């Protein structure tokens, strides 16, 4: 293997896709970034450690730019009004085999599949009801 | 509409699909558990709170159990050998349009799509390199 | 999906049935109240909580009012002359599967089924003899 | 005349119905127990008592066992892996006529009637949502 | 019933109407929101509790966006320069029947009917004179 | 013009309409009361103050009485068995145009329109669900 490659983060169906490419590997923390200023880029980071004697933790962070009314390459302040922050921590017991890990991955992709409650709540600016 | 519906968390292609159903909303925390004993169930929770004056924050958690049958006091009980924990926090500015929110949802699903770096590392008990 | 809805508390075979509707779900306590004066209303509440490491505990409560008119100083008010208070606690270990819970439910409906000892002692202002 | 008799606690439509029979009426506490090992038996008790000058109070209790075999040192014993404990108290003012009591009984049967919120939350290891 | 549905908040006569739809039900507080960013949305919330031994209180809140010179989907600061806040508390004695409540509703709609002093004062940026 | 005029608070379709008339403006609080003894009157008050340097705030209150005749000391007096209290506060930024203000007025009347969720809950002694 060699996982550290460029990938499509936002698939707008071939036209207008957001591709994110490797940009840093300092401290073993893989970073991928889109082709933008760092204030407006889509950014993804990922790392793993053995968090405890019985667990490993994957730390994954994503930054997504607010695009509506965005001025490309402009100075947009305050920074917090223009960015969303995703923070995922995945704790997996040291006993999990690859198959167990494949299942955990499916559970994560099922949670966010289109039409499912969580992604539709988020996309509609809503809570659960 | 009521987005508080059941969904398939683990899609095992129609056979052995883990589906999760609405089970509690006490204290504003939407919960969904699989059809098992509470000791062996998959569990998903979601809650949104206006964290800052200008942010809203979603807290989503998933628990994936490794089921087992344990003999306690000479009696067999349905149990979970261990659980894996997904723990995510999403902070979205109040200025985010629905289309802005859709971009976040797409970024999260692209992140975990099969074949992309992260889901590949996880499923192989590997880091990114 | 939702189970926090209106329901028939008293079947009077279609006419003069007492219906109870959702009223408040503050602090994990679901409350239902019948229509008209709150002073003469039936009330049902329900809350579940992990009582211990191995148990979940349901707390159901029902109030049945004796409708009446209070006349004081020529001013009459709709009141409940008095109220009966049902008060139940149901403890279920976390090892109970859905089947086990269904059986628990049947045991409760059987206990109060028409004709059986308990419901008929109550209906007649009596004890066991 | 007597209401201290055997009855069906669980209708399994004629086969595998759980029947509970009178066992002891010491100290004003009527107790019923199902057949076979007392260790795996269902238990129902009921007592009424004038709680105050104006109230009579019923105390009903039910125990539903999870049948199992304990094997210790090669010796196996019929035990209950665990038990759910139903626990209810019903207070009725001495002004209640028989009609009032019948209504109280109907309110209790309606509460647990199949399909209603409460019995279906319990039957599914769930709370209100 | 089932009151929790979408409704027209601002009726501009079919064309340019503002419809508000259910968006959250955490803690039994019903929330409705328009299809906008949360900074620019019309928002309505409603809840009821028994405020005292003798009263119930409906808490209703409405947020209305300043629309003149608005940039749709833009970041508009300060938040307070762009939003109006309505806060209604309706206290109703437990003796009020449904008919009493219907009258209270009429009094509320008469207060705000077009042409009446209060709504015309507000709409004209005025006090009473 | 002088918007301080009488209006019909409760429109009972020409017969038994509750109409309220200007009755005081002392201390900058506009008051309107119905044509009854001060003990049984409907009362409406309104005042506007520049709350912050950038806000203006209207405080509107309505009192709906439940009239009765009470015998005090062997003498009958016109009285109100109870009163229901509407209490609303509206905060509008100084930057709001008259058209912006008209939007607020329309939102408040749409909120209470017959058939919409809120007025329906209130009139039925129900919460939203």
Residue of chain B nearest A82, judged by CA positions: B93
Residues in chain C with CB shorter than 8 Å from the CB of D9 are 107, 110-111
Q: Cβ separation of B3 and A107 shorter than 8 Å?
A: no
Q: Smallest Cβ distance to C25: which of D7, D81, D128?
A: D128
As for how many domains chain B has, the answer is 1
User: How distant is the Cα of C99 from the closest Cα of chain B, in angstroms?
Assistant: 9
DSSP code at position C74: T
Residues in chain E with CB shorter than 8 Å from the CB of A129 are 4, 22-25, 30-31
Q: Is the dihedral of CA C27, C28, C29, C35 positive or negative?
A: positive
Contacting chains of B (3 CB pairs or more, <8 Å) are: A, C, D, E
CA distances in angstroms from D3 to A64, A79, C115, F76, listed in the order given: 71, 76, 9, 56
Distance CA B117, CA A44 (A): 11
SS3 of B50, please? Answer: coil
Find the Cα–Cα–Cα–Cα dihedral E68, E71, E73, E79, rounded to 10°: -60
SS3 of E21, please? Answer: strand
Are chains F and E in contact at 3+ CB pairs closer than 8 Å?
Answer: yes
User: What residue numbers bound the domain in which C40 lies?
Assistant: 1-129
Distance CA C14, CA F83 (A): 35
CA distances in angstroms from D68 to C17, D38, F7, listed in the order given: 43, 13, 76
Contacting chains of A (3 CB pairs or more, <8 Å) are: B, E
Mutate to test the interface with C, among B22, B37, B45, B75 (most CBs of C within 10 A): B37
Helices (H), chain F: 98-111, 117-123
Phi, psi of C3 (to 5 degrees): -115, 0
SS3 of F44, please? Answer: strand
Using a CB–CB cutoff of 8 Å, tell me whether D127 touches chain B.
Answer: yes
SS3 of A73, please? Answer: coil
F127: buried, middle or exposed (CB in 10 Å: 19+, 13-18, 0-12)? buried
Q: Cβ separation of C37 and E96 shorter than 8 Å?
A: yes
Q: Smallest Cβ distance to E38: which of B27, B30, B94?
A: B94
Selected residues 7-36 of chain B with any CB under 8 Å from a CB in chain A = 7-12, 18, 25, 28, 30, 32
Phi, psi of B69 (to 5 degrees): -125, 115
Q: Smallest Cβ distance to A126: which of E23, E30, E75?
A: E23
Q: Is the peptide bond before C22 cis (omega within 30 degrees of 0)?
A: no
Asked if E15 contacts F115 with a C-beta cutoff of 8 angstroms, the reply is: no
Q: Cβ separation of D79 and B76 shorter than 8 Å?
A: no
Using a CB–CB cutoff of 8 Å, tell me whether B64 touches chain A.
Answer: yes
Q: Which residues, 6 or more positions from E50, have their beta carbon under 8 angstroms from its beta carbon?
A: C38, E56, E57, E94
CA distances in angstroms from B55 to A44, A80, A83, listed in the order given: 21, 9, 10
Residues in chain F with CB shorter than 8 Å from the CB of C44 are none
CA F118 to chain centre: 17
Q: Which of A117, B65, F124 is nearest to D129 (CA)?
A: A117
Distance CA D16, CA B20 (A): 31
Q: Cβ separation of F72 and C75 shorter than 8 Å?
A: no
DSSP code at position A128: -
Using a CB–CB cutoff of 8 Å, tell me whether A129 touches chain E.
Answer: yes
Residues in chain F with CB shorter than 8 Å from the CB of E36 are none
CA distances in angstroms from F113 to C54, E9, E56, E110, F118, listed in the order given: 50, 9, 22, 10, 9
SS3 of C129, please? Answer: coil
User: How distant is the Cα of B29 from the closest Cα of chain C, in angstroms?
Assistant: 10
Residue of chain B nearest A84, judged by CA positions: B92
Q: Cβ separation of C35 and E98 shorter than 8 Å?
A: yes
Output the domain CATH number for residue F58. 3.30.380.10
Q: Cβ separation of F46 and E121 shorter than 8 Å?
A: yes
Strand pairing of F55-72 and F75-93?
antiparallel
Contacting chains of F (3 CB pairs or more, <8 Å) are: C, E
Are chains A and E in contact at 3+ CB pairs closer than 8 Å?
Answer: yes
Q: Smallest Cβ distance to E97: which of C25, C36, C79?
A: C36
Are chains B and C in contact at 3+ CB pairs closer than 8 Å?
Answer: yes
Q: Smallest Cβ distance to E26: which of B47, B94, B100?
A: B47
Maximum CA extent, chain F? 59
Q: Cβ separation of C27 and B25 shorter than 8 Å?
A: no
HEC-encoded secondary structure of C17-47: CEEEEEEECHHHCEEEEECCCHHHCCEEEEE
Asked if C5 contacts D117 with a C-beta cutoff of 8 angstroms, the reply is: yes
Q: Cβ separation of B118 and A84 shorter than 8 Å?
A: no
């Amino acid at each position: 293997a060699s996982n550290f490659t460029q990938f499509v983060l936002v698939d707008n169906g071939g036209t207008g896709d957001v591709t994110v490419a490797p940009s840093n590997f300092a401290n073993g923390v893989a970073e991928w970034i889109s082709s933008n200023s760092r204030s407006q880029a889509y950014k993804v980071t990922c790392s793993v450690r053995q968090s405890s004697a019985q667990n490993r933790k994957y730390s994954i962070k994503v930054e997504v730019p607010k695009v509506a009314t965005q001025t490309v390459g402009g100075v947009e302040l305050p920074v917090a009004a223009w960015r969303s922050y995703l923070n995922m921590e995945l704790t997996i017991p040291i006993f999990a085999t690859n198959s167990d890990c494949e299942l955990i991955v499916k559970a994560m992709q099922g949670l966010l599949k289109d039409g499912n409650p969580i992604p539709s709540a988020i996309a509609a600016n809503s809570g659960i009801y």
